[PDB]
Every structure is written in structure tokens, then in C-alpha cells.
């Protein structure tokens, strides 16, 4: 019915008016490309050949467009159509008369997409504003869109079968709009959290931590090669940190050439000892933490997620705030290229040697588990004798579960800490966790020491069978193993009952992901529809479509969210 | 023992039987995270291998068969009853977990191009097209014949030379996109000759005809099935996954010279990023690499049953130490470009890698001024129909956030469904307009002078007309 057509989603009101299928759009699998800049995207030649951007013939560009017209559709840098002044369209594929090929001012030649053509890149779902960013086009000879790795974080895209949509603006006006509003370098900093959206990620973060250690010393030829990939190099080789006996540069010395202009920043490495700041060696840091950049030169410190990641006050954030968006784009790209070429010399890997720990550490983990199981048994015996006293506001079952969970969690965390103590400097799990590129201390602990308690619906594994978790366990068994505690690590391998309980926990995780996607989508749509028309007028009042004043000044101070920074008042706290 | 239960009434035959068919192919399942086993269960259904031994006789749509399937070097005991050895899906591949050039970052994979040239992960894609000669129409007969442009009033300019006399292309003839696989003609009633009814190849198939069959179907009409074969050499978009839930496309392909090489001369067939392992905690992958190294050297297929208690990482490590390698499986690698030893020692070992059905060639689509729908006069939908990608409501909200009003306007009006209507000034209802006659008149006012041209999406015109059919009057007034 008419009401059925209009009412539902995919109806005329929403499925055909608010959103609709569009021309001049392309889609293909995305794959990485560290060599492309932040703003560049790699487009296959077939997608580039099908999509055409109409160019008006001017006295300036008549020769170039004439050559494109002569090439035709077959040769790649060609023109698919000619649009005359009358509006007549001459498709060049079917034979055009040699008279028709002649061009005059006012004709519109529809050239194939060429290098440097601004396009809009999208990945569904388009949750935030950074999910649609303008990319320059670079044509490369395979059939996948290729984008830089730093740009993956705004899109929330990884290269495991993902796909992205390419929209080509067809007019100079809309092309200028994209170029000056939505290009990738212009949206490095999000107004949502006044932090940079994009940061150094994956191999480059892991390797920048290693590159910036005090230990790293580079010889002459390696410095030559690293400087070769630096786009903004002045052409002057820095004086090596160690002139004699053999000229040897340092990783920080080369990274100082990457840092844009003169940027001053102080951040702390992840492994910074808390006592260091108060005690001596505060400035001459024993562990080479406390990153300090003065006059755009890395005086000291080990770079990590905190210094080069997506956080307020990062080196990239200070670069965007101080140097500008263009120099910051160059900064991102140069970090990636130089560090990735050093990683060929140094290399990274993950093996079983990383998971395995010392025999003493394994014995310590086993002892912690033994005494934890004994403690749980003691609590159970107290409960059976009714000696246990209920916690206020909780039933005896609830307080028994609380105490048992506390004991098991303390054992789990202590075993994790023992495993993390065992890790050597060379351990690669530790490299990735410390750099912040991937992983967490929890994952290391589960790999090496103890997987941990399996909880479903916020409780230990429930009694699915009559008064027992599995048929193999005795009825009314509240012990650690029966209710889901997985003593073995992933490296050690789970026992079969622990395997089933672990499967139950993982299933809860999967279900939570599936449900959260839908519910969050609905919430986001409702918020947008409620606040879509609110904007800052030229009075600087924030008014809706009805012109009712939502706010007299935007944010009550009339400032935009990206420019602002965290600061301390310093008059508030001190005593009189 | 220390008394736990003295009244056992039954015993499990083997705990590994709790897993299903797809989960039984995972080696060392107990050493993986649970979501990763769940993901491998779904990826294993999509892998490429010889699906059945009678695949030559069968004419199925979308059949992929790998050139050189190999049985796993590290196999579960329950795989024997699944017949995975008889019909394997995947190739054991020398895999290095390393960061080489940044093209394996995220989940992508660097593949060896020399290995790909030697037959590594090469597959064939068979597509079958079926057509039926239907004479059921009263005066319509869908005869099989080669259409002729002069004889048939309805025709298309795609190549018709391939078709033989019967209207079916002979096997062994190359077919490029937009070629006529089957030529069929419907005789046209002469109300007062021919509307073309040929079937055309899916774009970019670029295959060679394998088998052409002519039979009579259940209805008794003549039935023709044509199977087109396309070889599929792996590219830099194809999706490869291991048996431990690690999926990823091919980031780039380096030749054997460029790939890092051990001192023995072994260059990894696949290089995966070390960043995939820690967050996903698929240690079964690492243990499988170690056991595969030991198995390849020893010459016996490794046992990876889930719960064994006789196979430990330490035992596998000592076994590997016996064969002259580092006990944890690491190897000293040399950089292919410069020859210098890589300072870190890279973890190299054979690992069963699968090739999933998702390939970039099947997933690449581009649209520019294509056909439009009848109802909405908007671009079609789908890769087969050359449809444009949808600019959803979330996308328009992002563009509103940007402040790109004109890009939003182009994308939502000018690119999709531009249209013009004529609207009476006195009454907002649309008015009849003869551009060729140059007379524009509005019914209901008997007014000709006051008419204005309005540019609106065709979808909006359809919305307003559907409102009018519901007796709602959407009077759009320019004033």
C-alpha cells in the first residue's frame, strides 16, 4: 500500500530520499601500503578508467585535453566522452568523426581519473565524522584500494577482507569543498575528545620504541639509507653522537630530524618508575624514560604509544596544534617510512620462546595456585559449618561467592605478576605491550601463567546440570575447578573441562558484540535526528531550524572543540 | 588416588569428541582463545579444496578447486574420520612471523611471488550457466539459434561471432566479459519480428569454456548448461587464513630474491605480522609451526589432538633441537634486499594455510553513469546490475557534520536522480507542461501564465505524487 511504501525503511521517505544509490562510486578490498602518504589512496587502474571527472575546456588546458581525447577510452589516461556546448555527448568509444574530436572553449571532456584527483573515502558503518575523509588518488597496478596504516584508526579498518567505498566529486566546487574541509590532514584532531584521531600504529610504533632506546647506534651507511626516506631532510647530515673511535649516530638523533620544526613537549614512557620523579636522577633518567623534546630535537626518552599515539598532548597532537596540518601530515609519513626501513635491519617476531618462562617462575605460579585452591577449600569448609557470617546487604550465597572470587582473583593476578616478572628485555610480547602497539599485560599473563576465572552472566560457571556444572564433577561442588577456574595457561593447554568453560566465556563475548552493534546503531540514529539542524549562526548563537536559541554561545564560551587543550589553573589548589 | 569419586558409572571414550566436524580440523585447539576457534570454524567452511572427486562430471555454479591440495603436516586424529586427508583444503606453507616491509601490517600477509609462480595456492573457478528453450508461450518460441543483427530487430552490439549454428559457444573458446555464451531468440507476435534473448557472460569472468551440455530437463524442453573455467592465481587482495582463526588478505607479493632467506636458502612462502598473535592469543599457531618443523624434518605427520598430555611444547622443542635447529623454532634470517642478517631472529616454520573463497576480482565494482531503476529512476543495486554504492543516512549525517553542503547535494540529488518539474505559482500542485509545444497549462486554475520550473529529485516527485494519491496535497509554493 501507499502507506506501506512510504513508512518502512527502504521506502521513499528514507530509503530513496534521505539516502540513495549514487553514481561515480567504487568499492573494492583495502590492503596496506606504508609508502603512500596519509592523504594518498591507491586506486586500481580499472576503477580509475571507469570513473570519469568532467573537465571544462579552457584556453589553458585545450592541448592536454586534446591529447586525452586523441588517446580515447582504450589507453588509460584517456577521455570517455566529450560534452559539447549544446549538451550533445560524443562517446569516443564508438567512432567519432575527426571533426568531432576537435575541442573549443566551453566543451567538457570527461577524462579518466588521474593521479591527484580528490576523492572521498568511506567505510561502513560511518559512526563519526572521521569515517569519511578526502584522499588524493595515486594509481597503482593491482585491484585493491591501498591506504596508509595510520589512517586505519579513524576508519576502524584492518586489512582482513575489509572494503571501502570511493566517491569521486564531479565538480570543481564540490572538489574544493572536500579539499578544504574533509581532507585527511585537516582532520587529524577530532573535536569529540580534543585529541588526535590518527597515530603511529603497529610495526611503526613497536619499532619506534626500539629505535629510540639509548642502545640503538647507527653506522654511516644505515644513516644514509634512513635519511634517504626522510622527505623533509635539509640535505645536511647531523654530526654523529659518537665521533670516535668510529662515527656512530643514535636513533634519537635521526628521529630528531623527523620531528617537525621546533616542537617542545614532555611526556613519560609507559615503564616510567613512579619514584624517579621525586628521587635523584629525575632529569638524568636511569631508564631513559621521560621523553623530552626541546627545539624540535629529542633530548631524551623512549617513544611509545603515549608520545606518538592518539592521546592529548602527544607529539603528533602538539605538532598539529603548533606547526599546522600539512607539516603534521609529513610528520606521520616520515615516521612511518624511516622507522619501517630501519625495521628491515632490526626485525620483529613472535615465537614460542616468548611464551615460555623460567622453571622457577612456573614453580611459583603452581605454588600460588596450590595455596589459592587450599584457601577456597577453607572458605567452603567454613560455609558448610555455617561459621561464615553474611556480609551486610548480601545473602550468604552472595558473600560466599564474593570471598571465593576474591581469593581466585588475587591468585590470578599474582600469577600474572610473576609471569610478567619473568619476561626478559628481548621478549617480544613485552616489546608489543610496552610499545602499546598491540596486546596487554592481561594477555601476557593468560599466555604464560593462568587463563583465569571463566564468568558467564557475571557469575562463575552455573550449574547447568542438576547441582553440578558438568557430569564429571560431583554434585554441590563449589570448588575452583568445578565452577570454571582455568589454572592452565594457553601455552600449557586447557584440560577438557576447562576447554568447555572457556568456550562458554568466549560465547558470552561474541553475543555481547553482536547485541551491542544493533543497540548502539539505534541510539546513534536517534541522537542525530534529534539534533541534526542545530548550528552556530552568525550571531554565534546556537539555534535550531525554528530559530529557537539552544545556546547563546557555543559550549558557553563560543570555542570549537579541536583547538582547546587540557591545562591546570594553578591558583585553585594552593593554600593561602 | 586422593578420594574424589569412588562411584564413577561411565567413562568418556575421548574428550576430543566434544568438538564438531569443522572444529576437529583445528590443531591444538586447547592452546587457542575460544573466539578464535569459533572464527576458524566459520573460515574452514569457506576454504578452497577439491570439494568432491566427481567434480568433473558435476555442473555446479560457483565451484572452486585448488590445484595442489596438501594434507596437514600437523593433524588431529579425528581428522581421519572426517576424510580430510582424502580431500584436503589448503597447502602447508613455510610461514615466517615477522615484520618485513610493513605490507603485512594489520592482518595482511606478504606472499612469495616465486612460489605463486610455481603453483602455490592456485585454483580454478567453474561457473555454470543454464538456459531453457521454452515453447510454452501461445505464440512465443524461445528457439536456440545464433541471432543476426539484420534478421533480428532486437539485438545487442556485444560479440556474437563465438556462437556456433546451435547458438551455444563451443568448449575451448575464450570468453571475455560481455560476450554471448548462449544465443536464444523469442519469436515476436506481429501485432502491427525478434526481441533478442541471448545470455551474456558476467563482466570480467575472462574464462575458457570447459563443457557444454544439451539435454531435456524435467519439463521436456531443451536444456543447455555451459561451464566456464577461470584459473585464479593469488593476487594482492585474496584472503588467506590459517587453521587458528588468523585471516588476512595478501598485502604484497615479493619474488624469491626479495624475500628474507635463511642460511639454508629457505624463503618464507607467507610472512604474517607478529602483531596478530598477542592480542588474539592463538598460541596453537605457534605450536603448530614448531610441530610442523619437527614433522617435516622427522618425516612423520604430527599429532595435534586437543587433549593429549603426551605432547608438550618442551618435548617438541627438544625434538627440534635434535634436528639441528633452534629449540624454540627461531631461525637467523637474512634481508633479501641488502643481505645483512636481521638482528632479531625470525620464527619460521611450516604451517597449514588455507585459501578462502573471497577474492578481490569477485569483489571489485565501479559505477559511473550506469543504468537506472524504473520505479525511482535511481541507480541500480548490486555488482551484477552495475549498481552504485548506497549513500546511507549515516553517510549523509557525516557529510552534514563536515559542513559539505554541496557535496551532500551532489551525492544525494545530482549524481543519483536529477529531475525537473513544472509547478503552478497560484497552486502548489504540479502542472501539465509540453516543452515541444511550448504551451504550459495548469488544470484546476485555468491558468497558463503562472507556472514555474522546479528541480527536485525524482524520488521526491514520486513521494509527492504518492501523497497526492492519498488525498494529501503537498503544495510546493516558491513564494
Amino acid at each position: 500500500s501507499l502507506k506501506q511504501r512510504l513508512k518502512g525503511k527502504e521506502g521513499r521517505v528514507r530509503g530513496n530520499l534521505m539516502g540513495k544509490r549514487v553514481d561515480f562510486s567504487a568499492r573494492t578490498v583495502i590492503t596496506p601500503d606504508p609508502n603512500l602518504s596519509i592523504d594518498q589512496v591507491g586506486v586500481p587502474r580499472s576503477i580509475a578508467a571507469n570513473m570519469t571527472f568532467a573537465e571544462i575546456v579552457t584556453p589553458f588546458n585545450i592541448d592536454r585535453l586534446q591529447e586525452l581525447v586523441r588517446r580515447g577510452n582504450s589507453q588509460y589516461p584517456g577521455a570517455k566522452y566529450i560534452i559539447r556546448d549544446n549538451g550533445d555527448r560524443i562517446d569516443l568509444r564508438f567512432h567519432p568523426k575527426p571533426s568531432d574530436l576537435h575541442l573549443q572553449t566551453g566543451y567538457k571532456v570527461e577524462r579518466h581519473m588521474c593521479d591527484g584527483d580528490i576523492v572521498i573515502f568511506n567505510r561502513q558503518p560511518t559512526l563519526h565524522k572521521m569515517s569519511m575523509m578526502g584522499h588524493r588518488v595515486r594509481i597503482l597496478p593491482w585491484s585493491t584500494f591501498r591506504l596508509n596504516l595510520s589512517v586505519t584508526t579513524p576508519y576502524n579498518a584492518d586489512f582482513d577482507g575489509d572494503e571501502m567505498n570511493l566517491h569521486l566529486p564531479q565538480s570543481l566546487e564540490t572538489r574544493a569543498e572536500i579539499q578544504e574541509l574533509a581532507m585527511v590532514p585537516r582532520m587529524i584532531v577530532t573535536p569529540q575528545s580534543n585529541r588526535p584521531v590518527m597515530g603511529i600504529v603497529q610495526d611503526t610504533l613497536t619499532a619506534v620504541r626500539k629505535f629510540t632506546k639509548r642502545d640503538v647506534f647507527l653506522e654511516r651507511g644505515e644513516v644514509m639509507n634512513l635519511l634517504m626516506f626522510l622527505s623533509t631532510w635539509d640535505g645536511k647530515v647531523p654530526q654523529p653522537a659518537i665521533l670516535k673511535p668510529r662515527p656512530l649516530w643514535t636513533g634519537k638523533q635521526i628521529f630528531s630530524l623527523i620531528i617537525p620544526g621546533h616542537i617542545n613537549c614532555i611526556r613519560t614512557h609507559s615503564t616510567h618508575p613512579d619514584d624517579e620523579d621525586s628521587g635523584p636522577y629525575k632529569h638524568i633518567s636511569p631508564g631513559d624514560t621521560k621523553v623530552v623534546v626541546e627545539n624540535g630535537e629529542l633530548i631524551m626518552g623512549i617513544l611509545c604509544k603515549k608520545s606518538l599515539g592518539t592521546s592529548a598532548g602527544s607529539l603528533v597532537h602538539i605538532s598539529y596544534l603548533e606547526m599546522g596540518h600539512d607539516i603534521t601530515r609529513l610528520f606521520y609519513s616520515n615516521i612511518q617510512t624511516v622507522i619501517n626501513n630501519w625495521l628491515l635491519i632490526e626485525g620483529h617476531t613472535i615465537g614460542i620462546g616468548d611464551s615460555i618462562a623460567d622453571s622457577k617462575t612456573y614453580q611459583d605460579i603452581q605454588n600460588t595456585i596450590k595455596k589459592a585452591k587450599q584457601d577456597v577449600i577453607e572458605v567452603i569448609e567454613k560455609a558448610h559449618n555455617n561459621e561464615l557470617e553474611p556480609t551486610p546487604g548480601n545473602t550468604l550465597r552472595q558473600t560466599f561467592e564474593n570471598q571465593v572470587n576474591r581469593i581466585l582473583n588475587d591468585a590470578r593476578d599474582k600469577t600474572g605478576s610473576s609471569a610478567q616478572k619473568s619476561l626478559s628485555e628481548y621478549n617480544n610480547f613485552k616489546s608489543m605491550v610496552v610499545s602499546g602497539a598491540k596486546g596487554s599485560k592481561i594477555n601476557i599473563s593468560q599466555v604464560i601463567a593462568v587463563v583465569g576465572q571463566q564468568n558467564v552472566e557475571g557469575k562463575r560457571i552455573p550449574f547447568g546440570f542438576k547441582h553440578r556444572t558438568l557430569p564429571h564433577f560431583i554434585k554441590d561442588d563449589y570448588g575452583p575447578e568445578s565452577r570454571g577456574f582455568v589454572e592452565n595457561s594457553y601455552l600449557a593447554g586447557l584440560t577438557p573441562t576447562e576447554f568447555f568453560f572457556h568456550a562458554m566465556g568466549g560465547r558470552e563475548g561474541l553475543i555481547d558484540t553482536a547485541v551491542k552493534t544493533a543497540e548502539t546503531g539505534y541510539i546513534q540514529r536517534r541522537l542525530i535526528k534529534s539534533m541534526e539542524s542545530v548550528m552556530v549562526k552568525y550571531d554565534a548563537t546556537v539555534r535550531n531550524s525554528i530559530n529557537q536559541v539552544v545556546q547563546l554561545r557555543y559550549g558557553e564560551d563560543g570555542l570549537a572543540g579541536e583547538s582547546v587543550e587540557f591545562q591546570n589553573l594553578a591558583t585553585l589548589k594552593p593554600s593561602n | 588416588e586422593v578420594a574424589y569419586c569412588s562411584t564413577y558409572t561411565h567413562c568418556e571414550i575421548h574428550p576430543s569428541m566434544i568438538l564438531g566436524v569443522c572444529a576437529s580440523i583445528i590443531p591444538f585447539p586447547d592452546h587457542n582463545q575460544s573466539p578464535r576457534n569459533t572464527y576458524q570454524s566459520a573460515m574452514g567452511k569457506q576454504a578452497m579444496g577439491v570439494y568432491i572427486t566427481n567434480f568433473h562430471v558435476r555442473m555446479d555454479t560457483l565451484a572452486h578447486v585448488l590445484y595442489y591440495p596438501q594434507k596437514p603436516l600437523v593433524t588431529t586424529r579425528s581428522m581421519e574420520y572426517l576424510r580430510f586427508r582424502e580431500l584436503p583444503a589448503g597447502i602447508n606453507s613455510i610461514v615466517a612471523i615477522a615484520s618485513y616491509t610493513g605490507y603485512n601490517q594489520e592482518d595482511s600477509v606478504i606472499m612469495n611471488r616465486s612460489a605463486v609462480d610455481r603453483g602455490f595456492f592456485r585454483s580454478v573457478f567453474y561457473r555454470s550457466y543454464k538456459e531453457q528453450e521454452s515453447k510454452k508461450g501461445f505464440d512465443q518460441e524461445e528457439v536456440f539459434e545464433k541471432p543476426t543483427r539484420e534478421t533480428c530487430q532486437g539485438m545487442r552490439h556485444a560479440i556474437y561471432d563465438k556462437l556456433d549454428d546451435d547458438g551455444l559457444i563451443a568448449p575451448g573458446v575464450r570468453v571475455s566479459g560481455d560476450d554471448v555464451i548462449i544465443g536464444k531468440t523469442v519469436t515476436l507476435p506481429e501485432n502491427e519480428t525478434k526481441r533478442d534473448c541471448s545470455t551474456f557472460l558476467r563482466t570480467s569472468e575472462t574464462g575458457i569454456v570447459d563443457q557444454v551440455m544439451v539435454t531435456l530437463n524435467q519439463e521436456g524442453y531443451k536444456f543447455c548448461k555451459i561451464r566456464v573455467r577461470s584459473v585464479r592465481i593469488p593476487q594482492i587482495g585474496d584472503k588467506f587464513a590459517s587453521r587458528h582463526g588468523q585471516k588476512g588478505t595478501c598485502g604484497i607479493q615479493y619474488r624469491q630474491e626479495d624475500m628474507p632467506f635463511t642460511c639454508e636458502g629457505i624463503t618464507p612462502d607467507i610472512i604474517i605480522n607478529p602483531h596478530a598473535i598477542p592480542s588474539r592469543m592463538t598460541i596453537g599457531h605457534l605450536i603448530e609451526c614448531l610441530q610442523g618443523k619437527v614433522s617435516a624434518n622427522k618425516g612423520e605427520i604430527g599429532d595435534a589432538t586437543p587433549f593429549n598430555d603426551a605432547v608438550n611444547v618442551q618435548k617438541i622443542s627438544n625434538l627440534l633441537s635434535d634436528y639441528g635447529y633452534h629449540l624454540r623454532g627461531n631461525e637467523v634470517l637474512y634481508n633479501g634486499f641488502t643481505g645483512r642478517k636481521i638482528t632479531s631472529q625470525i620464527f619460521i616454520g611450516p604451517t597449514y594455510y588455507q585459501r578462502l573463497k573471497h577474492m578481490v576480482d569477485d569483489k571489485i565494482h565501479s559505477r559511473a553513469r550506469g543504468p537506472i531503476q524504473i520505479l525511482n529512476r535511481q541507480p541500480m543495486e548490486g555488482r551484477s546490475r552495475d549498481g552504485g554504492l548506497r549513500f546511507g543516512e549515516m553517510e549523509r549525517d557525516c557529510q552534514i557534520a563536515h559542513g559539505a553542503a554541496q557535496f551532500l547535494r551532489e551525492r544525494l540529488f545530482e549524481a543519483s536522480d536529477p529531475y525537473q518539474v513544472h509547478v503552478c505559482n497560484l497552486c502548489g500542485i504540479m502542472a501539465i507542461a509540453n516543452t515541444r509545444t511550448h504551451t504550459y497549462e495548469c488544470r484546476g486554475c485555468r491558468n497558463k501564465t503562472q507556472i514555474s520550473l522546479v528541480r527536485m529529485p525524482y524520488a521526491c516527485k514520486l513521494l509527492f505524487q504518492e501523497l497526492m494519491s492519498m488525498s494529501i496535497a503537498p503544495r510546493m509554493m516558491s513564494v
Binding site: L408, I442, V451, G452, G458, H502, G505, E508, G509 | -
Partner: peptide, 8 residues
């Protein structure tokens, strides 16, 4: 899969 306070 860790604990009651962590993740499943």
C-alpha cells in the same frame, strides 16, 4: 575469560 571484574 579472565575474571569477575574483567572480561568473560
Amino acid at each position: 575469560i579472565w575474571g569477575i571484574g574483567c572480561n568473560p
